[PDB]
Symmetry: D2
Subunit: 120 residues, 4 copies
């Protein structure tokens, strides 16, 4: 209900997610940036029984950057929380890992942050 | 074949995963540490068509820290790569996000690293 | 000139810095949040000869959370870049490490992000 | 006494540091890897009054990747803890930020981990 829907980051990337009663996140991620083109499968987990003291709902998901058209040989994971209300928000930090040789493995993992809203 | 199996981190946590032909990771995570007890659902993605130049296979997965017995109101995401061979390895960095109030949201996200092997 | 001055994060924390000709950052950090009170020493480094292609100036600094009044037994490091102009900005990610036992060392390091401006 | 000395990471990089009575870290970093050559200035902070319950000493430092010979237009920060004894150790996580355009700013920050020992 809260987490199910279409979400938009600050850089124009679309996250279309379903929050299953079990705790499953399934969907598609469309990335406006990077070595990516078009639509990618998303899987993840959320807290299906969150705290009743105004705290956010912990969640996370993974996109492997491989569809029928492109393969970036990389995966992003987002770790975050859903903050429900009028101005509904998913505040995340992410890790992007690239497939490297053991000599390049030190420089394999980019870190960042994304804020997602339900407003295009 | 490579990624499918039972994996062990440096702190004694068990990761039992199946790597589906589509790019799906499904399994269970048993955590030896933290505010956790017993067995938790794992979902993730991997690069189902990796590079043929000695590079690792990018992957990622999520555990929401909620089963039938416990709820820690938190989720970990691991971002990493599978390095195949005799001494097969998953080198990861992780983000653990806790469900917080907006006043506590600065301190919501722990970062770390795990190395997983197929040797108990 | 650019980096020298008083800076304000999104959570109301004051960063007063001098950018030395050698590449030295020296100053004080006043933290509006956490287990902190009042004014703490800052040391860091910046790129004293940045690129002339509209790119930001790489920098970083450390605060150990210990003055004459408090000791939180912790240190934050910020890694970022100075973006000069009319709306001058320091975009950072940070690591906060706490002094722990080896059993608690997995949960020692919080990660986040701060944006600093010259507007109070 | 504990933190003052020559330190070696897992990838063969030398950290030569002095731990001042005030809490100041000063030194040189010699990087065995990356777009770097030779010797770079290090500044940082440590907890000069740590806890007497077997807990590590929180510290941090910054290297801007610029000397008289090279400029990588980047800075690394390490956040960590000193674990004293027979097998003395500095366990860190790091952020490497590169000077980028605002279009490339999402991919500006690499994350990793280093363990330093006093054994070459
Ligand atoms: O460049 C790549 O290796 C593949 C595309 C990565 C897209 C990045 S992942 C973090 C951030 N979130 C997005 O909306 N896309 C970028
Ligand atoms: O303490 C909690 O909030 C829930 C348990 C967290 C387990 C952590 S997640 C990162 C690391 N990997 C493990 O094997 N377990 C710990
Ligand atoms: O709570 C502590 O352990 C000490 C105070 C930490 C202050 C944090 S560090 C990251 C963020 N930046 C700030 O302005 N202060 C908080
Ligand atoms: O490649 C660059 O941009 C400059 C050199 C970076 C060296 C990296 S920083 C993290 C790690 N620690 C080291 O010993 N060196 C590498």
């Amino acid at each position: 209900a809260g987490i199910t829907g279409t979400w938009y980051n600050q850089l124009g990337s679309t996250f279309i997610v379903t929050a299953g009663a079990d705790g499953a996140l399934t969907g598609t991620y469309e990335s406006a940036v990077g070595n990516a083109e078009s639509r990618y499968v998303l899987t993840g987990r959320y807290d299906s029984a969150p705290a009743t003291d105004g705290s956010g709902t912990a969640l996370g998901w993974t996109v492997a950057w491989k569809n029928n058209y492109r393969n970036a040989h990389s995966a992003t994971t987002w770790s975050g929380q859903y903050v429900g209300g009028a101005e509904a928000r998913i505040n995340t930090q992410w890790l992007l890992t690239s497939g490297t040789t053991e000599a390049n493995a030190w420089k394999s993992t980019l870190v960042g942050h994304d804020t997602f809203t339900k407003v295009k």
